[PDB]
Amino acid sequence: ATVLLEVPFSARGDRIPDAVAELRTREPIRKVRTITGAEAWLVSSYALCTQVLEDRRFSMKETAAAGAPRLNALTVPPEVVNNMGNIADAGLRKAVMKAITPKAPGLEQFLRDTANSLLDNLITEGAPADLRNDFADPLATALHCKVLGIPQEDGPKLFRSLSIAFMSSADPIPAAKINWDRDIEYMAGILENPNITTGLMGELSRLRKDPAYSHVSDELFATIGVTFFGAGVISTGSFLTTALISLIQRPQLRNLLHEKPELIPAGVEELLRINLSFADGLPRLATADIQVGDVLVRKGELVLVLLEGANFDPEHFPNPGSIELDRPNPTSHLAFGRGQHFCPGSALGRRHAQIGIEALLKKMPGVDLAVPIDQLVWRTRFQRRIPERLPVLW
Ligand code: HEM
Numbered sequence: 532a533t534v535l536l537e538v539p540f541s542a543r544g545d546r547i548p549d550a551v552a553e554l555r556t557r558e559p560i561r562k563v564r565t566i567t568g569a570e571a572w573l574v575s576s577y578a579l580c581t582q583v584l585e586d587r588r589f590s591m592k593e594t595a596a597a598g599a600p601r602l603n604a605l606t607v608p609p610e611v612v613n614n615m616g617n618i619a620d621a622g623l624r625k626a627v628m629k630a631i632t633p634k635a636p637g638l639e640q641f642l643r644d645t646a647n648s649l650l651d652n653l654i655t656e657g658a659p660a661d662l663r664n665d666f667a668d669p670l671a672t673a674l675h676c677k678v679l680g681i682p683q684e685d686g687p688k689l690f691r692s693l694s695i696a697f698m699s700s701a702d703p704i705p706a707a708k709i710n711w712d713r714d715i716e717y718m719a720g721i722l723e724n725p726n727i728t729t730g731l732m733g734e735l736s737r738l739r740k741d742p743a744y745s746h747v748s749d750e751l752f753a754t755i756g757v758t759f760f761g762a763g764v765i766s767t768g769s770f771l772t773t774a775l776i777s778l779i780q781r782p783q784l785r786n787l788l789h790e791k792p793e794l795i796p797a798g799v800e801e802l803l804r805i806n807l808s809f810a811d812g813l814p815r816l817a818t819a820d821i822q823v824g825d826v827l828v829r830k831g832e833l834v835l836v837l838l839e840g841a842n843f844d845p846e847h848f849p850n851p852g853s854i855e856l857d858r859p860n861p862t863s864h865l866a867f868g869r870g871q872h873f874c875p876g877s878a879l880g881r882r883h884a885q886i887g888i889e890a891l892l893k894k895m896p897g898v899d900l901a902v903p904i905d906q907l908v909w910r911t912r913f914q915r916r917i918p919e920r921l922p923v924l925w
Pocket residue numbers: 591614615631758759760762763764766767770808813814865866867868869871872873874875876877879880881
């Protein structure tokens with residue numbers, strides 16, 4: 532007697548389990564048990580993953596409903612699962628999205644300067660260097676402070692909420708609320724701080740005092756800052772970290788991008804496609820009975836969209852495990868999701884990784900792992916897959 536297949540399959544972010552391809556082939560929508568004990572449908576083909584993500588009847592909002600089958604425990608207030616809907620309802624979606632593009636004057640230079648400064652410090656200190664804790668995450672953190680308009684020196688404290696905020700836990704996490712409430716208070720103070728005039732929080736601080744937004748809650752303004760800082764920092768830091776691994780493990784690609792940095796955008800797009808940073812399928816709750824492949828998903832059931840199921844689907848990306856800079860459909864992966872909840876920070880996330888990689892390859896053209904790959908320690912029960920340290924030499 533066997534138990535129902537458990538998700539997630541593996542917290543390792545350096546390789547996809549052979550099991551995913553067998554699952555996709557045999558049962559692209561399959562029942563699984565999540566860490567809470569709930570049952571769910573795990574969708575692992577490109578076609579079915581896009582179907583689910585493009586059908587809003589598979590609702591993100593409704594995953595927060597009391598009594599729903601859960602992937603993991605909420606680490607935010609339930610109304611925050613509807614964060615982008617709340618932002619849209621408040622009339623803030625266009626301004627938010629405009630503030631988080633990589634387009635602001637000087638932002639890319641700041642990113643480059645920050646990356647180069649981080650790297651110089653690593654070079655000064657001498658190998659081995661930890662490229663997660665001492666490069667990718669600080670770069671993500673610095674970027675998001677700059678984007679939000681908040682002091683760089685406030686970044687580390689906000690950052691250290693994230694090892695708990697993005698836990699994938701069977702049970703509510705006491706520290707998540709402590710940190711959430713504290714971080715909200717911080718962002719509320721930011722909105723009241725007259726020195727904060729730039730970035731997302733500077734713009735929100737002005738809109739908050741504009742009569743066209745006088746009935747938007749202060750809670751939502753503060754929430755936008757906390758949520759965009761955290762989702763952005765965890766996602767860019769984790770993605771860049773695991774992209775660096777994939778790059779370091781491909782010396783020929785490393786050398787090609789070092790030699791021809793104009794291919795870095797195509798290389799990052801493939802690193803996005805093969806990225807295993809999201810540790811769990813994206814969750815959605817059926818609000819109707821909906822046919823997905825051979826399964827009639829019933830109203831109230833949980834569906835988990837396995838990004839790497841889609842992104843390594845050979846029917847969509849031939850030779851899926853190979854980084855190919857000349858694919859005909861290069862941005863068609865689901866690394867940034869798809870549909871209603873497509874990542875609003877996609878461009879910023881691309882540029883963060885492009886600039887970080889560009890700077891790394893210039894400063895450390897010899898970069899290599901300083902430990903055997905198997906020695907990386909993969910964070911467990913977390914919504915991202917990340918090695919706790921990424922020791923390199925160069
Ligand atoms: C490479 C970096 C990133 C990756 C791989 C990534 C990935 C994703 C994915 C897959 C989703 C969809 C979640 C879902 O549908 O359930 C998403 C949503 C989101 N991302 Fe990104 N992300 C990245 C960078 C960023 C950045 C830089 C920001 C903000 C500055 C950000 C903010 C968000 C937010 C707020 C959402 C939720 C949108 C919503 O609920 O509708 N992300 N991200």
